[PDB]
Ligand binder design. Structure first.
Ligand SMILES: O=C(CO)[C@H](O)[C@H](O)COP(=O)(O)O
Ligand SMILES: O=C(CO)[C@H](O)[C@H](O)COP(=O)(O)O
Ligand SMILES: [Fe+2]
Ligand SMILES: [Fe+2]
Lengths: 219, 219
């Protein structure tokens, strides 16, 4: 039940279709697409127009997990749905009413993700955990790739896994062949990996390794 | 007169290939639309895409950054480091045009100043002598393929008359159908999207825009 979703944040963004195609051909279970509006986090990546072009290049089959690091997630639900996103993962810190937003995401036919930054207590995620498809536990401060994995986040993963046995739990930030062990032992089953996969000459084997470490923990 | 294609409606999953075709077709520069989802209701891309584009396209091509962002002060260094040549910010968006103009120059970039259709051209007067280029929007910013606003031409004419040394750019629904109106009013930098982007022979369209604009200039 473990899935690997490469992040393309530090890929060749001038050739994004190509980068995504090769992640998929390398065995990626899904694509984790980082959307940053320069307000919720101090960086700007891309938005629904890029998603639309990607969906056109990759076809209908690939699963897009949209990491919405934006300050008004309500605004981009419909645009992302129309663009062909499968899952809309918004930040708990980015809205006054997660309940209403969750409803709107489903109304627009997408799966629901809910993310929390390192400084945000997992306790605040809990009231909504039964209403979402996937919780995202950030393992770096969002906005930049290539940062150091924060192992102190693991109790958040373990606690969610304990309280919500069926919940899909994603980790994101500095996850690689080493740190994936900590994530998997803590209970995570969805692994986002950027620089570790993207700056490897053999992404197939990195992905295979991440998934195996994960599966053995799930066992 | 210089022609700078806009890539707003291109295949955004292949920005490199799109821009390369534009340069190989003799584009004078590239006009790169940066939208943060706040100043305008759309998100395109930011400096990370610019960095990858600069790496793909080489040191020589000129990038005109149309910064439709609410905090233009924030992205000056990041765009400079990314390799942008000109930083064109919106007068409506800045807290302090004078300070920002200075910062742009401290960062080695040329200075552009843009105004939306509803913004009176006289707002530019205090700054025209400090900037390299004025951008007169000929559509409401946020999206490509909108209809050219001929009622903006008196702004262009007024600028050209009052500030003979000022480079003046028009942007929004400019193509072979409307370029003459822009040139006769005094624009010498022409941004065009759809009309160039779809062509089999972008070189011919670019040459046409440039020639129409140049001959109108010679009166
Ligand atoms: O959301 C993110 C950061 O905001 C990215 O998904 C994360 O950085 C993945 O990159 P890496 O594996 O290189 O840390
Ligand atoms: O800034 C812009 C819109 O916000 C674009 O540069 C403009 O739309 C150019 O595209 P087109 O030539 O298709 O109008
Ligand atoms: Fe992410
Ligand atoms: Fe523009």
């Amino acid at each position: 039940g473990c899935k690997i979703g490469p992040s393309i944040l530090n890929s060749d963004l001038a050739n994004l279709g190509a980068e995504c195609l090769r992640m998929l051909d390398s065995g990626a279970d899904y694509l984790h697409l980082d959307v940053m509006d320069g307000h919720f986090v101090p960086n700007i990546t891309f938005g629904h127009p890029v998603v639309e072009s990607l969906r056109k290049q990759l076809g209908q089959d690939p699963f897009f997990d949209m990491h919405m690091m934006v300050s008004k997630p309500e605004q981009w639900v419909k645009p992302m749905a129309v663009a062909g996103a499968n899952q809309y993962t918004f930040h708990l810190e980015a809205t006054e009413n997660p309940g209403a937003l969750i409803k709107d995401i489903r109304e627009n036919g997408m799966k629901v993700g809910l993310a929390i930054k390192p400084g945000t207590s997992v306790e605040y995620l809990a009231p909504w955990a039964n209403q979402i498809d996937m919780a995202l536990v950030m393992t770096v401060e969002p906005g930049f790739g290539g940062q150091k994995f924060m192992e102190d986040m693991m109790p958040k993963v373990h606690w969610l896994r304990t309280q919500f046995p069926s919940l899909d739990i994603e980790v994101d930030g500095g996850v690689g062949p080493d740190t994936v062990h900590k994530c998997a032992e803590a209970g995570a089953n969805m692994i986002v990996s950027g620089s570790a996969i993207m700056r490897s000459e053999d992404p197939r084997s990195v992905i295979n390794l991440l998934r195996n470490v994960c599966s053995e923990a799930a066992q």
